[PDB]
Amino acid sequence: LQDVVNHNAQALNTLVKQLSSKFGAISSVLNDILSRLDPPEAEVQIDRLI
Amino acid sequence: QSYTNSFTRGVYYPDKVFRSSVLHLTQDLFLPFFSNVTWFNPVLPFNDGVYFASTEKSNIIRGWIFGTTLDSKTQSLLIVNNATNVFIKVCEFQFCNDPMESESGVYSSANNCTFEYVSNLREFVFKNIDGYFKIYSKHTPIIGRDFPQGFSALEPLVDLPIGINITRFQTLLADYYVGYLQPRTFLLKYNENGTITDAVDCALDPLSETKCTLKSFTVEKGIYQTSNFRVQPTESIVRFPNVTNLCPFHEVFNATRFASVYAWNRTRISNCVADYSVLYNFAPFFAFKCYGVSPTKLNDLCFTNVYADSFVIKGNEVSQIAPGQTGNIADYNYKLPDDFTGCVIAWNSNKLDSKHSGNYDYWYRLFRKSKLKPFERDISTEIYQAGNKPCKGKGPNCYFPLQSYGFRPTYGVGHQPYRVVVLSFELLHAPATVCGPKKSTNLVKNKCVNFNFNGLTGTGVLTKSNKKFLPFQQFGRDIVDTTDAVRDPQTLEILDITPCSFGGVSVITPGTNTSNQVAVLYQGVNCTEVSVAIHADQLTPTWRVYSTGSNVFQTRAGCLIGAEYVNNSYECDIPIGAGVCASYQTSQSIIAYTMSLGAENSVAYSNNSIAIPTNFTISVTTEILPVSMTKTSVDCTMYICGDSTECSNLLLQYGSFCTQLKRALTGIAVEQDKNTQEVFAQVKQIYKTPPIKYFGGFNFSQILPDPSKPSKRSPIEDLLFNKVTFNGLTVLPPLLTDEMIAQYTSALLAGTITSGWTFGAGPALQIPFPMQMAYRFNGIGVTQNVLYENQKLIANQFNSAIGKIQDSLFSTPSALGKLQDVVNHNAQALNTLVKQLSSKFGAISSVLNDILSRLDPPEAEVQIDRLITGRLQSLQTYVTQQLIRAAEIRASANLAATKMSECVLGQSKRVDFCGKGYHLMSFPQSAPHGVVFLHVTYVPAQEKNFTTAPAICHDGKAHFPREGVFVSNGTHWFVTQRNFYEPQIITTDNTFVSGNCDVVIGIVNNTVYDP
Amino acid sequence: LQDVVNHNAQALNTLVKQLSSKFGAISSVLNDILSRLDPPEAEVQIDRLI
Ligand SMILES: *[C@@H]1O[C@H](CO)[C@@H](O[C@@H]2O[C@H](CO)[C@@H](O)[C@H](O)[C@H]2NC(C)=O)[C@H](O)[C@H]1NC(C)=O
Ligand SMILES: *[C@@H]1O[C@H](CO)[C@@H](O)[C@H](O)[C@H]1NC(C)=O
Ligand SMILES: *[C@@H]1O[C@H](CO)[C@@H](O)[C@H](O)[C@H]1NC(C)=O
Ligand SMILES: *[C@@H]1O[C@H](CO)[C@@H](O)[C@H](O)[C@H]1NC(C)=O
Ligand SMILES: *[C@@H]1O[C@H](CO)[C@@H](O)[C@H](O)[C@H]1NC(C)=O
Ligand SMILES: *[C@@H]1O[C@H](CO)[C@@H](O)[C@H](O)[C@H]1NC(C)=O
Ligand SMILES: *[C@@H]1O[C@H](CO)[C@@H](O)[C@H](O)[C@H]1NC(C)=O
Ligand SMILES: *[C@@H]1O[C@H](CO)[C@@H](O)[C@H](O)[C@H]1NC(C)=O
Ligand SMILES: *[C@@H]1O[C@H](CO)[C@@H](O)[C@H](O)[C@H]1NC(C)=O
Ligand SMILES: *[C@@H]1O[C@H](CO)[C@@H](O)[C@H](O)[C@H]1NC(C)=O
């Protein structure tokens, strides 16, 4: 049971941590990309993050 | 000259790369198998490479001539072989040797010789490709004129970089066969020494397409999925509404004056044609960049709401004009949408948009108090207020937002004015109004045709429709958003767009070893449709099985060709669908029959009729169960990145994917270890079988370990073991060595055969085997007296039963099908994973080191990223597949553990769980990544039809057997156990009384004796 | 059983409905992309749809 709980917790923690992965893009936060670049290339960066 | 068949000739080495003992599938220009070959001074046209096989003994064939004209006008290739050295020239000659020391080369012309070169059954492949004349020469001097229908590869004699055009060629004299090549696909079997010992085409016969599909030269008996058939389009219609020709552009584009960048005119064009080639040369404007819709395709489905914008700018101003751009021009002159599907045309306009002294009229909106949005014009030219107080003129930052451009003809190129046309059009609105002219065609009339209805392009069958389009709807779709109805305004007729027929084809083959005939199943199609497609050369799988009579059958699965339907019934051999099955029968051919669901047996039920067996059989049946899987550990970094830190840095930005994959693989591995632990290690203490091994006639030699061999495995285990069977991927060894697993099996079996089932419920309790078997009879409703009264026979019944098991595992090679399937599945997964390392994934190359040593790292980053994404999706797919397979094997291992707990460590009352019959006992045997259970079952036999009755009325009261059944042989009545005929005289010992003789439906008068 | 049938039908319906998904490309139909763009540029859109 403890292993099941730990597995679910680890899955959720990995999912939230991977919100900070750049995934080969400029950054990991959408707002900085929006208020850093022009909308066209920002679209490609947001596409990679998505 | 006649026509013969190219049996297997024309195979050459496709490349100079060594390959050993492989089956490589390559697509290239080849001589197709069994093609028609002309056997012969004619001028043979050079069909993109020829196979020329000269058979001679007088050396009459002195060489070849190639070219397009061969009359000293275009460059022609002359090849001659005099006695020692091949003179190869690329000259421009009128004629040649054609009119010991009986002949010499005089030719007729030697102009512009651009290239020079010197060095029976002479085969020569001449392939002209990529500026190369590749000559593949096989000089196998056969001693004799017998033309062998055999195999001989053609090693590349030379690859001349002549780089000339060749359409025709002739032979030079002082017989021969000619065949023409086509682009085909071949399977070549490269031998150890590097030689192509055999080749298999991929377009002749269904059989030699499944040979390519499995990448083998010997296919097994079975239905094989293969390529998908599809009726190819017959014609190609292009229907438009009534069209008109106006083209009102050049008269506008040529005009004396356009408007400024801020005063631009949105010119609307409608009801004309896209005569745009004039804008290239008739109005020769140089700057032509089409964004969203590249040019030279502007002939149909082109414009719906085309608009034209007229800009007048400087020279160094078009650069800022692009979709998604920003700047003062973008801010306050005009703003473009990001999705601008149009064209930008710019050209210098000195003599037509400038004054000789300079025209100070083309101004621009320097400032404005309104943010520009896509497709909006600036009109207000009031002073741009820049202060909180009302700002008019000077004072605050305000200035007049209109600066004159000095369009002088004396300025440089960077200042010369540009006239610009922006064609902004939307390729969407369904109703149209403008594109170029094209041929129209009437209704296809139920014909699979390329349709081009008002720009809606596709392939389909256009039939009369009953769908009531209200007089504004042009298209008509379905819930799947597929256009199932269209109507051209010119015809104004609603017609549906049911697509061209397709599906798949599957090859039924009885195995290459058995035979070579095949059948084909076009899945889900009417046989009339497929026959019609055969007739008018429309089926994509160009190989045509001859549709003779009594060989085309229409099943609910589709159309089966090559096998006749027989109204007889047989067990299924090669499943097809809808209950039909095909098989090879004996003169010998493939037949399709309705599957017979076993025999039909009517049980003779009656009001009073029972059948009790008088004999039995100790059957031994093998049941194979996967227990484990190959533990595979994959190094994410090395697989994705070939020990490259440059690639590792890029991989590090992809989150903890490698950590997740490693965790999943380690979980799978520890799960495999726990699976074999739980299946085999259910015994606390390793039990040793006794020194003397007499078990009341029960043999137990093929299952008990024999010390006179290594690894201490049983002979059955030996047969099972002998019967089964880089780049960051590692196969971790199992924790339990095969000897340890065999020792667990030996302990389990020794405990079973010595202590009975007691060792599974606690301490092992010794008990003679003839007593344990009597208990196991008691456990299936058979009195123990049966065993001792028939001990020895049963022993033999067991012993022979085990003996056949060996042959069942010896003669039959597919007995261990499930375990070998598991092994093959793992091997195929690993093979696919390593093979996808060679996939470019839309990059420059499949090898990292090339990309590293080809480009600067900023540019190489994109290619490395594409390769990383491809290989990472490969890893994720492999890991997910492994997880699913591991879950399946976990279920199988749980079943195996349950069986060993219930079938081996005890006797199970669950029906058909430990065999087919009444379970007696079971024996485990280790096998590679699995277990094999020798389920011992009691099976009754030798029936005897008998008369019965639920109750006996002796003393005016009912009587019932305590555990048996009341039966009779006509005259006497006997109470007997219900699983073995043991008649007994009815007495109060076996009978109990309950009630009187007026409630039982079928009570019978009789005597219940007193003992 | 009805849930099993409906689940299979929903899976197939989703699979065919995502044929109309642009996937961040010009369009969801290959035919239009082919007869709208030169093959070097159309390669990117075809790759995205693929
Ligand atoms: C049990 O079965 C084995 C068979 O595996 C018997 O061994 C055979 O013995 C005879 C002579 O006694 C030989 O001719 C055979 O070659 C043996 N079989 C094999 C496969 O080699 C054995 O006799 C049986 N009985 C006992 C008590 O072991
Ligand atoms: C080669 O020359 C022939 C001469 O008739 C011509 O038809 C063909 O188009 C040419 N093609 C090339 C340049 O390969
Ligand atoms: C205008 O028409 C003349 C006709 O001779 C042509 O030469 C010229 O290139 C045209 N220019 C434009 C911009 O259409
Ligand atoms: C647009 O209209 C204006 C009206 O003054 C005119 O001067 C200009 O030449 C026109 N430009 C065109 C024809 O695109
Ligand atoms: C195939 O077509 C024929 C003629 O249209 C028709 O009679 C037959 O019923 C069709 N087959 C099936 C299975 O519907
Ligand atoms: C069994 O008995 C019933 C009594 O109603 C009778 O109808 C039926 O025919 C009998 N079955 C036989 C004689 O096979
Ligand atoms: C029962 O069957 C066996 C073989 O299956 C046979 O040898 C035997 O004679 C039969 N009868 C008895 C009474 O065992
Ligand atoms: C057993 O059944 C058959 C029919 O299958 C029948 O002919 C026979 O008479 C029955 N047995 C007896 C004891 O009558
Ligand atoms: C029935 O079984 C008895 C057993 O004693 C035997 O004597 C008799 O011959 C058998 N047959 C008939 C028709 O009674
Ligand atoms: C059974 O025996 C009793 C008394 O002997 C008699 O009354 C009854 O009718 C008998 N029943 C049958 C079915 O013979």
mmCIF file of N, CA and C in Angstrom, chain B residues 525-561:
data_model
loop_
_atom_site.group_PDB
_atom_site.id
_atom_site.type_symbol
_atom_site.label_atom_id
_atom_site.label_comp_id
_atom_site.label_asym_id
_atom_site.label_seq_id
_atom_site.Cartn_x
_atom_site.Cartn_y
_atom_site.Cartn_z
ATOM 1 N N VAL B 525 -15.223 -6.547 -50.080
ATOM 2 C CA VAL B 525 -15.496 -6.020 -51.409
ATOM 3 C C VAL B 525 -16.336 -7.027 -52.183
ATOM 4 N N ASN B 526 -17.200 -6.507 -53.048
ATOM 5 C CA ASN B 526 -17.999 -7.356 -53.919
ATOM 6 C C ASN B 526 -17.126 -7.942 -55.021
ATOM 7 N N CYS B 527 -17.332 -9.229 -55.313
ATOM 8 C CA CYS B 527 -16.510 -9.894 -56.318
ATOM 9 C C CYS B 527 -16.730 -9.300 -57.702
ATOM 10 N N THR B 528 -17.933 -8.792 -57.970
ATOM 11 C CA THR B 528 -18.168 -8.106 -59.235
ATOM 12 C C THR B 528 -17.275 -6.878 -59.360
ATOM 13 N N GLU B 529 -17.149 -6.106 -58.277
ATOM 14 C CA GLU B 529 -16.296 -4.924 -58.296
ATOM 15 C C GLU B 529 -14.842 -5.290 -58.561
ATOM 16 N N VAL B 530 -14.333 -6.317 -57.880
ATOM 17 C CA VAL B 530 -12.936 -6.686 -58.070
ATOM 18 C C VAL B 530 -12.708 -7.266 -59.463
ATOM 19 N N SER B 531 -13.664 -8.030 -60.001
ATOM 20 C CA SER B 531 -13.512 -8.546 -61.357
ATOM 21 C C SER B 531 -13.514 -7.419 -62.382
ATOM 22 N N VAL B 532 -14.395 -6.432 -62.204
ATOM 23 C CA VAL B 532 -14.429 -5.289 -63.110
ATOM 24 C C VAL B 532 -13.117 -4.517 -63.040
ATOM 25 N N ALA B 533 -12.600 -4.309 -61.826
ATOM 26 C CA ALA B 533 -11.306 -3.653 -61.677
ATOM 27 C C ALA B 533 -10.181 -4.455 -62.317
ATOM 28 N N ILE B 534 -10.244 -5.786 -62.245
ATOM 29 C CA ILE B 534 -9.269 -6.621 -62.943
ATOM 30 C C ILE B 534 -9.346 -6.378 -64.444
ATOM 31 N N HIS B 535 -10.566 -6.339 -64.986
ATOM 32 C CA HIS B 535 -10.723 -6.235 -66.433
ATOM 33 C C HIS B 535 -10.139 -4.935 -66.970
ATOM 34 N N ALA B 536 -10.538 -3.798 -66.405
ATOM 35 C CA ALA B 536 -10.032 -2.519 -66.900
ATOM 36 C C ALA B 536 -8.809 -2.039 -66.124
ATOM 37 N N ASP B 537 -7.850 -2.940 -65.912
ATOM 38 C CA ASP B 537 -6.498 -2.635 -65.429
ATOM 39 C C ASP B 537 -6.482 -1.507 -64.394
ATOM 40 N N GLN B 538 -7.207 -1.720 -63.294
ATOM 41 C CA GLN B 538 -7.380 -0.668 -62.302
ATOM 42 C C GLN B 538 -6.946 -1.032 -60.888
ATOM 43 N N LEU B 539 -6.558 -2.276 -60.623
ATOM 44 C CA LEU B 539 -6.178 -2.665 -59.272
ATOM 45 C C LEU B 539 -4.712 -2.340 -59.008
ATOM 46 N N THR B 540 -4.452 -1.708 -57.864
ATOM 47 C CA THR B 540 -3.084 -1.342 -57.507
ATOM 48 C C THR B 540 -2.144 -2.538 -57.376
ATOM 49 N N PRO B 541 -2.520 -3.664 -56.738
ATOM 50 C CA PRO B 541 -1.602 -4.810 -56.705
ATOM 51 C C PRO B 541 -1.506 -5.465 -58.072
ATOM 52 N N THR B 542 -0.594 -4.948 -58.901
ATOM 53 C CA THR B 542 -0.586 -5.238 -60.330
ATOM 54 C C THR B 542 -0.501 -6.726 -60.646
ATOM 55 N N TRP B 543 0.039 -7.543 -59.743
ATOM 56 C CA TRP B 543 0.027 -8.987 -59.956
ATOM 57 C C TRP B 543 -1.421 -9.454 -60.030
ATOM 58 N N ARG B 544 -1.763 -10.166 -61.098
ATOM 59 C CA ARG B 544 -3.132 -10.598 -61.347
ATOM 60 C C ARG B 544 -3.200 -12.118 -61.304
ATOM 61 N N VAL B 545 -3.915 -12.648 -60.312
ATOM 62 C CA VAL B 545 -4.246 -14.065 -60.313
ATOM 63 C C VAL B 545 -5.322 -14.307 -61.360
ATOM 64 N N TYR B 546 -5.097 -15.295 -62.223
ATOM 65 C CA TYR B 546 -6.014 -15.544 -63.327
ATOM 66 C C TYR B 546 -7.394 -15.908 -62.797
ATOM 67 N N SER B 547 -8.382 -15.082 -63.136
ATOM 68 C CA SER B 547 -9.734 -15.243 -62.619
ATOM 69 C C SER B 547 -10.523 -16.242 -63.455
ATOM 70 N N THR B 548 -10.027 -17.472 -63.546
ATOM 71 C CA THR B 548 -10.737 -18.511 -64.271
ATOM 72 C C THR B 548 -11.995 -18.922 -63.507
ATOM 73 N N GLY B 549 -12.848 -19.685 -64.186
ATOM 74 C CA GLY B 549 -14.090 -20.117 -63.577
ATOM 75 C C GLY B 549 -13.863 -21.017 -62.379
ATOM 76 N N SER B 550 -14.832 -20.979 -61.462
ATOM 77 C CA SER B 550 -14.801 -21.765 -60.227
ATOM 78 C C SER B 550 -13.567 -21.455 -59.384
ATOM 79 N N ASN B 551 -13.111 -20.203 -59.414
ATOM 80 C CA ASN B 551 -12.014 -19.777 -58.557
ATOM 81 C C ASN B 551 -12.230 -18.402 -57.944
ATOM 82 N N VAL B 552 -13.386 -17.783 -58.147
ATOM 83 C CA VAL B 552 -13.735 -16.520 -57.511
ATOM 84 C C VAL B 552 -14.934 -16.777 -56.612
ATOM 85 N N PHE B 553 -14.752 -16.570 -55.312
ATOM 86 C CA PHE B 553 -15.783 -16.835 -54.320
ATOM 87 C C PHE B 553 -16.060 -15.564 -53.534
ATOM 88 N N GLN B 554 -17.324 -15.345 -53.197
ATOM 89 C CA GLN B 554 -17.747 -14.147 -52.476
ATOM 90 C C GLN B 554 -18.127 -14.545 -51.055
ATOM 91 N N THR B 555 -17.237 -14.265 -50.110
ATOM 92 C CA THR B 555 -17.511 -14.473 -48.699
ATOM 93 C C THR B 555 -17.830 -13.136 -48.041
ATOM 94 N N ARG B 556 -18.409 -13.204 -46.842
ATOM 95 C CA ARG B 556 -18.699 -11.976 -46.114
ATOM 96 C C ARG B 556 -17.435 -11.203 -45.767
ATOM 97 N N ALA B 557 -16.280 -11.870 -45.743
ATOM 98 C CA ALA B 557 -15.016 -11.174 -45.555
ATOM 99 C C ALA B 557 -14.576 -10.412 -46.796
ATOM 100 N N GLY B 558 -15.005 -10.830 -47.974
ATOM 101 C CA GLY B 558 -14.631 -10.148 -49.197
ATOM 102 C C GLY B 558 -14.698 -11.094 -50.385
ATOM 103 N N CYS B 559 -13.688 -10.995 -51.241
ATOM 104 C CA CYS B 559 -13.587 -11.819 -52.440
ATOM 105 C C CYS B 559 -12.325 -12.667 -52.368
ATOM 106 N N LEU B 560 -12.486 -13.982 -52.486
ATOM 107 C CA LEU B 560 -11.376 -14.923 -52.412
ATOM 108 C C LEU B 560 -11.134 -15.495 -53.806
ATOM 109 N N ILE B 561 -9.919 -15.307 -54.314
ATOM 110 C CA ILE B 561 -9.537 -15.730 -55.656
ATOM 111 C C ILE B 561 -8.354 -16.678 -55.557
#
